């Protein structure tokens, strides 16, 4: 309820990098370090 | 220009089972969210723009 209450001017911005891209980066590092 | 609110919203309706002798709603941030209706005694619901 509080998360929907913050209409006094306080917001939260979304990160530029989505988790599905961090997962891709981690997979690339794992493949490189295992191959 | 109500009976102690003087708010500004899009008040539609309140479907909550509000207690009889209680008029002004509040929340965790101490914000008014309810109005006693002078005629039908129907509680409204403050909501900003």
Curated annotation (Swiss-Prot), chain B:
Effect of residue 6 to K: In strain: Omicron/BA.1
Result after altering residue 29 to D: In strain: Alpha/B.1.1.7
Function summary: Attaches the virion to the cell membrane by interacting with host receptor, initiating the infection. The major receptor is host ACE2. When S2/S2' has been cleaved, binding to the receptor triggers direct fusion at the cell membrane. When S2/S2' has not been cleaved, binding to the receptor results in internalization of the virus by endocytosis using host TFRC and GRM2 and leading to fusion of the virion membrane with the host endosomal membrane. Alternatively, may use NRP1/NRP2 and integrin as entry receptors.
Subunit structure: Binds to host ACE2. RBD also interacts with the N-linked glycan on 'Asn-90' of ACE2. Cleavage of S generates a polybasic C-terminal sequence on S1 that binds to host Neuropilin-1 (NRP1) and Neuropilin-2 (NRP2) receptors. Interacts with host integrin alpha-5/beta-1 (ITGA5:ITGB1) and with ACE2 in complex with integrin alpha-5/beta-1 (ITGA5:ITGB1). May interact via cytoplasmic c-terminus with M protein. May interact (via N-terminus) with host bilirubin and biliverdin, thereby preventing antibody binding to the SARS-CoV-2 spike NTD via an allosteric mechanism.
Name under which the protein is recorded: Spike protein S1
Organism for this UniProt entry: Severe acute respiratory syndrome coronavirus 2 (2019-nCoV)
Taxonomic placement: Viruses, Riboviria, Orthornavirae, Pisuviricota, Pisoniviricetes
């Amino acid at each position: 309820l509080i998360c929907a209450q913050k209409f006094n001017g306080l917001t939260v911005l979304p990160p530029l990098l989505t988790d599905e891209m961090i997962a891709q980066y981690t997979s690339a590092l794992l493949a490189g370090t295992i191959t | 220009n109500f009976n102690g609110l003087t708010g500004t919203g899009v008040l539609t309706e309140s479907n909550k089972k509000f207690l009889p002798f209680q008029q002004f709603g509040r929340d965790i941030a101490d914000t008014t969210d309810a109005v006693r209706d002078p005629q039908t005694l129907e509680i409204l619901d403050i909501t900003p723009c």
